[PDB]
What we know:
The structure is cut from a larger assembly and holds chains A (146 residues), B (229 residues), C (57 residues), D (112 residues), E (96 residues) and F (45 residues).
Chain C: E1 47-48, E2 54-55
Antiparallel strand pairs in C: 1-2
Chain D: H1 9-17, E1 30-32, E2 39-41, H2 47-60, H3 76-82, H4 90-96, H5 98-101
Antiparallel strand pairs in D: 1-2
Chain F: H1 10-17, H2 19-24, H3 26-38
The complex binds magnesium ion (MG) (31 copies) and zinc ion.
Chain B binds six RNA strands through helix 1, strand 1, helix 2, helix 3 and helix 6.
PDB class: ribosome
Keywords: mitochondrial ribosome, large subunit, protein-RNA complex, ribosome
Entry title: Structure of the yeast mitochondrial large ribosomal subunit
Amino acid sequence: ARTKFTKPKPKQPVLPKDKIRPPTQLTHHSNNLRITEPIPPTTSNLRCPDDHPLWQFFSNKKFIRSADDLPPSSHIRPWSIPELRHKSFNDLHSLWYNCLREQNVLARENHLLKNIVGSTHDEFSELSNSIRTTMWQIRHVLNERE
Amino acid sequence: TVGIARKLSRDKAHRDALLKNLACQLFQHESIVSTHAKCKEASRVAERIITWTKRAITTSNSVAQAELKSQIQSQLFLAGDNRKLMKRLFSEIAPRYLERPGGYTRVLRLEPRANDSAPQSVLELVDSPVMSESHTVNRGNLKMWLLVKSVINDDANQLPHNPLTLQNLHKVAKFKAEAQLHGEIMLIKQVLLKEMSLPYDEALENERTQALLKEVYSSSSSYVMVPRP
Amino acid sequence: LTRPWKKYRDGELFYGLSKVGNKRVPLTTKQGNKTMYKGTRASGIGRHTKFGGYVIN
Amino acid sequence: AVPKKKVSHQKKRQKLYGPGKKQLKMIHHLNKCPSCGHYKRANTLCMYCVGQISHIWKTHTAKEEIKPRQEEELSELDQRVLYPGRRDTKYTKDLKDKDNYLERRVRTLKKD
Amino acid sequence: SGSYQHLSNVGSRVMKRLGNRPKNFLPHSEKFIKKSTPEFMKSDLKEVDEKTSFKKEWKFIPGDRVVVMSGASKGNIAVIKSFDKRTNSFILDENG
Amino acid sequence: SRGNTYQPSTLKRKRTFGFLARAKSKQGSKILKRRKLKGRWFLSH
RNA sequence: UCAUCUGAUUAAUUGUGGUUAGUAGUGAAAGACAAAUCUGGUUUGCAGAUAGCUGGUUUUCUAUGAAAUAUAUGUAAGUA
RNA sequence: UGCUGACAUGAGUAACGAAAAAAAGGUAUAAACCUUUUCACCUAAAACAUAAGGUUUAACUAUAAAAGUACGGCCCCUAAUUAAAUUAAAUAUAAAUAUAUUUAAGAUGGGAUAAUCUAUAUUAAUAAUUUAUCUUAAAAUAUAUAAUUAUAUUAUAUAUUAUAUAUUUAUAUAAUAUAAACUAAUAAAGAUCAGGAAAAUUAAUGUAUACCGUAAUGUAGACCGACUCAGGUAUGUAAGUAGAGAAUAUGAAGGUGAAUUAGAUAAUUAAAGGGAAGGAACUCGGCAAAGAUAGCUCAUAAGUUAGUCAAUAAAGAGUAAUAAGAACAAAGUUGUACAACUGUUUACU
RNA sequence: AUAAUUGAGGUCCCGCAUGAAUGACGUAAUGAUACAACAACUGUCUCCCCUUUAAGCUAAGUGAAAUUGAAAUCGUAGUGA
RNA sequence: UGACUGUUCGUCAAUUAAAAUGUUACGUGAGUUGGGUUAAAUACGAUGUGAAUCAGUAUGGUUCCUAUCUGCUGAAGGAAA
RNA sequence: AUAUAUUUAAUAUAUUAUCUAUAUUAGUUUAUAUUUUAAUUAUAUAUUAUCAUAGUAGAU
RNA sequence: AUACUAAAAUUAAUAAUUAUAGGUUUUAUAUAUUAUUUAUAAUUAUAAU
Lengths: 146, 229, 57, 112, 96, 45
Ligand SMILES: [Mg+2]
Ligand SMILES: [Mg+2]
Ligand SMILES: [Mg+2]
Ligand SMILES: [Mg+2]
Ligand SMILES: [Mg+2]
Ligand SMILES: [Mg+2]
Ligand SMILES: [Mg+2]
Ligand SMILES: [Mg+2]
Ligand SMILES: [Mg+2]
Ligand SMILES: [Mg+2]
Ligand SMILES: [Mg+2]
Ligand SMILES: [Mg+2]
Ligand SMILES: [Mg+2]
Ligand SMILES: [Mg+2]
Ligand SMILES: [Mg+2]
Ligand SMILES: [Mg+2]
Ligand SMILES: [Mg+2]
Ligand SMILES: [Mg+2]
Ligand SMILES: [Mg+2]
Ligand SMILES: [Mg+2]
Ligand SMILES: [Mg+2]
Ligand SMILES: [Mg+2]
Ligand SMILES: [Mg+2]
Ligand SMILES: [Mg+2]
Ligand SMILES: [Mg+2]
Ligand SMILES: [Mg+2]
Ligand SMILES: [Mg+2]
Ligand SMILES: [Mg+2]
Ligand SMILES: [Mg+2]
Ligand SMILES: [Mg+2]
Ligand SMILES: [Mg+2]
Ligand SMILES: [Zn+2]
């Protein structure tokens, strides 16, 4: 520890002027740089495609299907098993895929309703259930045929 | 040590820091609200600082001047918004008090704060200029404003001015040119009217102010004292 | 204060509504040692390597 | 260290409300405010008038709300894209409803 | 809300317990429910279960015309506009 | 200073008291059966 | 807890996992520790163990009303 | 000293848990929330990265992003160990079971390559217990008269320039270029206490790169302590100045100023500072509290088991210092009893 | 050895009732062991004084505890399980 | 007032006019201390075949309490003066 | 350096105000320091303040 | 004067008279440099820290 005694030794001979090397890089900065306000990215720069496949997750181009713009359960009816029974395999497959697609759009919407607004209306849920029923019927018919 | 100043439930250094801080804040803002005790001690410091500044401004002795400056430096935290505070003290603050002998700060009792019941007070510099250009009014001296408000109220009611109010006005005047005072009052009054619902007739208001000033400026028992028989 | 609407000392927790609860409960991916690997019926896809990698089949 | 007996209703009453010291006095000391004839404590500035003055000062000595240079001409759609509003936690919500836990100064009666 | 409960079914046993409340303590839960609902949402009639509710098996169908007795408007005539399945009850046009 | 006798480590606790540990040994099986008979909801960690 | 004091390259300290315990392990041995403390844990059961011991045993009114002695007792706080 | 519930009493008493706050503005709503400034506190941490742990506590539901190379798991491989698992007849045993032997499981360990970026798959053939890197030698730099003296340098870690060979991309060479610390890799080598286990090459053909961990908290209000508990809790980095050091002082940056405030500071208590003349008269007992005239370099007796053991000896000196003047390391000598000694012991007298 | 010693060290031996691996005996070192002496130093004391901070005290907010037959709970002498 | 002892006592030293004898739960531990003394550890002497024991010896070694009422020391408010 | 007025023939001079004492590169892995090189990036300048038991000491 | 209380002093600002705390001024004290000095007039004169 430092005390009354303390003889501080010098640093170094710092290699006499002539002996040093020239620095590999000479000119560094721009000694004149201004701090300018940032430049936030704008959407005008984009060209969002109209027929972009992710629009297929919405009904038409619409955030939520309004209560008026939903198919009411008075009109909509799920597919019957017997009726399905006389349908080709390919057609059945197509139907299934359509159903799935519909569910996805409902599903997203349903999630939005539940998580954010916190609604309990459950029209979307009901629709999804109906779709699921149809799907299961289809599956049953497929099994049955085999 | 015992009974020279308040202790404020803080050890020496911390207390000192607090008091200096308070002084600095007062210089910055002209008026502040705090606990009564803190205010009372803060005023002591601030007044002393002001007097030192005055002495520095006046005294011919270079040595004395330097010493006073040093003292002033010691008694402040010149860092953030107080960086130019030294300059301010000499150039702006101290001159206002050149003729006034002590009593540079004014402590006014408020209501005790609801949550803590701690007794509160306003601490403020006395003659602070109420009107800054490129700004309208300044964050100035509460007392003056209050007085003006009272006057306005009286006028509205068409009652005579309370003697106390008159006394206060006189006090305010003592170290103040008349015209300047009038101007200040006028400036206050318009603002007050705007704030309140009351209307504003300029000339009439001016006249009223003049009348008020005049009375202020030009001055005008059961026991019988008798010699021992 | 932790939360300024509760000034006084109540029977309130720093977070949540009760420290205790049933600890005997199926554990998920998030809990355990580094070595604890739960998995989520996602990859019986390829085969692990001798060295640590994964060769898809 | 410890009470020998349950302290009777009488005795506790007389300890508490008996003496003068322990009773709340009536605040006799209060008078009219010169600026607006409302009640105020004696030797004390009226809390309404002072508050008003403070407010006016604030309005006048208001600091310039340093709004950024970019966000002023930032398209609404663009803004939406950039900064979508999240759901705040319970705690945050609680904090936000200040009215629930925070008190505004009451006004006195008019003195007569 | 902000839950993700809808995407899962967890605490299945717990749900079952809370879903299938024994019927003799049904008065309890129902009282609480009644307490915690506004006057316009709440209805005086007791709910029927999924098994107890009938599905036709109704004595009437929405659309047809009906006479109402033993109420405040006893002897009323009304068109039955719709039914509430859970409660096994009917809603009547403008009347009843 | 005593009191802090439980020093949680998930590995140790699953390995010692866990369902799989219980089910692997005959004594463990007995314990699980006992808990089933009582109708406990949680047969072990 | 604060101060003070001791070891501080070792018979050192310590992380992670494992083994050994309830007639019973571990123990540089203090009957020390074996999940807030053991001349032998805890839990469930035998089980309402047993207690010549302590305490407790809830309305009213009427009639009569003792003893604390003798003998015996592993008996003298009991019982005949 | 019944049991359960409710409600009293002490009592509006004690306490509110290591503590530095102030103003202005959010907000004529704020001691406690947020922002700015001031002041302070921690700083080989109260910081920054992490492990474990856990009511997701986070900067949150629109949420913690990986083919892999100073990224971890799984996966391969095993250790300690574990396994109603495996050999007419493995062996033994009232049953339960136990045993040796195989097989499988089991991290706290091992596991190709890689910014001049890298390919793990399929088929065919035939390591390390600890510890030190001295002395010498070589060459370099200065004095003096090839040889002496004194000094530092001496195995590795790049960039630049100049050369010779394949043809600006390659190979090798020469010259130029600080200090004290640290890291990794290299070689050499001393000690007795003698220092893990386990999964081959070439050729041809290939590759679309899975799953899970990832917030924040982590010497703590987010773990274990019944509490937002002065306790317990693993690893790395830990700005400079100073110094032998991670001591001690400060603290750049970062973080923090708290579920109690405001006053007042009676008696009295705790934790400190100072104290005239005395100096153990105190007391069971100098308990407690004082008390350090270099921390570097010299110099250090008796005794002794010959070990500067005693020894950091006491005393004493050198440098520094002449009465004003940091913090931390460092507090005497001797006799006797008992035990050789370093160790271990009644977690909580 | 102290002004003065039931303590300490030395020596004497009617060892009430030592003694040799339940080791005997003297020594160097070591010991937060236990007694004692000297030096130095001091609030330990003669003899207490002053100062600081956190409490105590008052105001505001929150808000315990053991205890409790019921109490309208004085002194003295006498009495009395 | 000191030396000695856990000691009250006692033996001395120095004083003093004197260094009286008691009672007060051999006054006073919700006022302090804990040296003596009745626990757990250990050792020595003795006794016992031994676990262990002692009108033995020695080192170490654990209780805490915010005051309800009486009482006392102070300080107020109410009150009939 | 920038801002604001002045003079000059946006440019330069001088006045006032605000802000600035940095930063990058070399010296064989790392970190720090030194010196060079880059850059406007400074004073053995006056006076303060904080912390170190009131930092320590002499008076008071 | 004081734990809180209580006690005691003041609450003057008009025709006079009364200072309670803070400040302000005064002399004094405390510090430690100061005549090799400060102040006024032109290195000189006077007053003195
Ligand atoms: Mg916890
Ligand atoms: Mg985790
Ligand atoms: Mg527990
Ligand atoms: Mg086991
Ligand atoms: Mg271990
Ligand atoms: Mg024993
Ligand atoms: Mg042991
Ligand atoms: Mg009779
Ligand atoms: Mg008996
Ligand atoms: Mg009872
Ligand atoms: Mg009390
Ligand atoms: Mg009290
Ligand atoms: Mg208190
Ligand atoms: Mg606190
Ligand atoms: Mg505010
Ligand atoms: Mg450092
Ligand atoms: Mg962190
Ligand atoms: Mg394996
Ligand atoms: Mg804690
Ligand atoms: Mg004595
Ligand atoms: Mg003595
Ligand atoms: Mg020391
Ligand atoms: Mg020993
Ligand atoms: Mg022996
Ligand atoms: Mg030892
Ligand atoms: Mg209170
Ligand atoms: Mg007593
Ligand atoms: Mg008593
Ligand atoms: Mg001891
Ligand atoms: Mg500090
Ligand atoms: Mg006067
Ligand atoms: Zn008012």
